[PDB]
Amino acid sequence: SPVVVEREREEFVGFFPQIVRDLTEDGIGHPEVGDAVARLKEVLQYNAPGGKCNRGLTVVAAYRELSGPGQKDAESLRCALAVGWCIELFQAASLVADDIMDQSLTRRGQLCWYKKEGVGLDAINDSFLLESSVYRVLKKYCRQRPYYVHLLELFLQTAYQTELGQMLDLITAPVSKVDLSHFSEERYKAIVKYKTAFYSFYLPVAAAMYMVGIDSKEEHENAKAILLEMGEYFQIQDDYLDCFGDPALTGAVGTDIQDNKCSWLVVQCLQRVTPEQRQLLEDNYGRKEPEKVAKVKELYEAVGMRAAFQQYEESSYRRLQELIEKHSNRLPKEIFLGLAQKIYKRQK
Amino acid sequence: SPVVVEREREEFVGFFPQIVRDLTEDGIGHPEVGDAVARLKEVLQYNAPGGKCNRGLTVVAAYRELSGPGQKDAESLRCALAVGWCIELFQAASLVADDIMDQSLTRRGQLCWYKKEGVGLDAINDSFLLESSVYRVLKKYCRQRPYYVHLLELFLQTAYQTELGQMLDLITAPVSKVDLSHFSEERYKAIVKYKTAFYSFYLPVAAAMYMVGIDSKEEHENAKAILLEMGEYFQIQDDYLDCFGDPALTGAVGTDIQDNKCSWLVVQCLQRVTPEQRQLLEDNYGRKEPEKVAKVKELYEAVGMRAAFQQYEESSYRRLQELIEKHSNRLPKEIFLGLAQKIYKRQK
């Protein structure tokens, strides 16, 4: 529901300064480090805010579907928000780093933090601080709570998992050289499982689970199961909406495949190929040549990926509705649905 | 004692593969991420090992001075080592990053990991993984131990503190522009308090304190007090031994002040100056010009820093022997001494 979804939406956003005061307020006037904490504010404000928040929001919603009448005090509700901005600072720490290693230019419609003159390679250390900001906020909100260690272990573990998916990516599709040898489906599914799925789906729900006390191992596994198919499919749909999409498109409906970006479409091409066609690609693909690009998509339409998407889309839903069944024994399905109802949109 | 000091020394080093198997063994054959964990091994082996180990060693020694007959099982002893290699992986995560932001060339007599062809800016993510390796090892060795959360909180907090000292540094002495305006004593003392003191002295001892159960807040403060003067003085002596030293010098007795490096010597010059002399510097200092450099040190000798070092040296010892008193009420002085007996060497 708009009315509700929005309300939650706005309560989240409106909480940012708070996290901001948290992180810096007392640091701001320190006779020693005050200068540092002062640039920290800037980094925080430049980078953290401004995305969609779906990720952090997912926590709040989840706790709301999980908590009982008992646990809806205002305090509890603030931790949910706090714990929410945590995934939000986590992701920002990512993006910053990631922009340097991709030598990107823009993000969130801003110029990449590293590109800001005077900054540069210092952003290397800023993503580090953004990272520890995450643990500062938990110590501040969750320190005396039965689930503190779990959250700490939760965040840390996913940090690792995602860094490997990042690592995988970085090896597979090196941003200064084409080579489509390494573009396998297992590898794509694997780049996707670790670089975003874990922190984008599982993490948010897993945090609300432990916060209501569901620490059952095999309950984190029922969760991990459904959620990870969601996340995979989510990646895939982005990839699709990336080139074959437009109508109402989530702001910037621009692109990239000039940056030899290993995507499901690409992988799906390589399977419906001919050595010749492969060569069509092999050469061109990963190019910032207007004409070349166009041809590349001729290729995709040439092979009809437009169809395959709808083919895949039509399966993911199904598998989901089951996986819910196989996995929503103990936890409220409303969660997975809600989550799902805003993922599956489809756009062709 | 050589016999003992060495023994501990060698027990530490000989434990590395172990940490190494820990971190990767099961990652090595994963159908999904195996490739990643495999490069992780390389990163670990390239970077972690090979320094002096004083830092990690300090833990082992400390626990040995702290534990009672009860806690000297072999298991306990392994955690001390494990917990030791942790500061060692912590520092490596640092150095890697730091080499990129200084655009350094060499380290530990190896070529900087980022400089290795094929690597590059990917090292950005490798220092991240080196970082999470630290928390992997604690979860593995300390997870079911009364002091687990403290250690986790300990490491995380210092990670932050040091990142600010790094941040301070990066702003003060920007590696592509001279400006000696920002070279204050309070700032140097502050760059030193956060970028190394905390993780190089306090962290090791603080980890052995909590491991024997000394979690008393004001006992971490008695510790923090003495140790931080040690660390400061340690920095200062390096700075000194940097230019005015040689005889037996800890391997490479080369240099840097070509990289406009904010050091105690420099700061100490600016105080014994003349606007003219300041100009001698202002221009030259931070140069990779054979002749220029020489002149710079004329300046330091010109002003006689050779004397001031010995002046300062002669105070640090004193203040120490007191600070021990003011602070070694509850904890064994042997610790601070031992620590100290291998710091104060002096070299002129």
UniProtKB/Swiss-Prot annotation, chains A, B:
Q: Which residues form the signal peptide?
A: none
Residues the record lists as binding Mg(2+) 2: 98, 102
Does the record bear RNA-binding in its keywords? no
Q: What is its main location?
A: cytoplasm
Can you tell me which residues bind dimethylallyl diphosphate? 107, 195-196, 235, 252, 261
Pathway where it operates: Isoprenoid biosynthesis; farnesyl diphosphate biosynthesis; farnesyl diphosphate from geranyl diphosphate and isopentenyl diphosphate: step 1/1; Isoprenoid biosynthesis; geranyl diphosphate biosynthesis; geranyl diphosphate from dimethylallyl diphosphate and isopentenyl diphosphate: step 1/1
A single Gene Ontology biological process assigned to it is: geranyl diphosphate biosynthetic process
Question: Which parts of the sequence bind Mg(2+) 1?
Answer: 98, 102
The record's subcellular locations are: Cytoplasm
Residues bound to isopentenyl diphosphate are 52, 55, 91, 108
Keyword Membrane found: no
**Which reaction is recorded as catalysed by this protein?**
isopentenyl diphosphate + dimethylallyl diphosphate = (2E)-geranyl diphosphate + diphosphate; isopentenyl diphosphate + (2E)-geranyl diphosphate = (2E,6E)-farnesyl diphosphate + diphosphate
Give the EC number(s) under which this enzyme is classified: 2.5.1.10, 2.5.1.1
Gene Ontology CC terms, in alphabetical order: cytoplasm
Record-linked Pfam families:
polyprenyl_synt (PF00348)
Q: Which cofactor does it need?
A: Mg(2+)
Its quaternary organisation is: Homodimer.
UniProt protein name: Farnesyl pyrophosphate synthase
Q: What are the top taxonomic ranks of the organism?
A: Eukaryota, Metazoa, Chordata, Craniata, Vertebrata
Gene from which this protein is expressed: FDPS
